[PDB]
Design a protein around this ligand. Structure first.
Ligand SMILES: CCCCCCCCO[C@@H]1O[C@H](CO)[C@@H](O)[C@H](O)[C@H]1O
Ligand SMILES: CCCCCCCCO[C@@H]1O[C@H](CO)[C@@H](O)[C@H](O)[C@H]1O
Lengths: 22, 22
């Protein structure tokens, strides 16, 4: 479960990074 | 890296739970 959580967090980071770029 | 991240999250949870108790 915490590996899944870490994976979700990594993807949230990517989303936020792309939103900041937009 | 995901194993390390998961482990850090687990330990942060423990730290926060203990602080909350105090
Ligand atoms: C404390 C409340 C503010 C929360 C800020 C969370 C951090 C924003 O997280 C995002 O992380 C990415 C790293 O992968 C960066 O590339 C983005 O620019 C940054 O917006
Ligand atoms: C799976 C969640 C990942 C984020 C990890 C770091 C933040 C955990 O935030 C939570 O804060 C509460 C104190 O108000 C504690 O009681 C919880 O035990 C702790 O898990």
């Amino acid at each position: 479960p915490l590996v899944v959580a870490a994976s979700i967090i990594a993807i949230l980071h990517l989303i936020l990074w792309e939103l900041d770029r937009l």
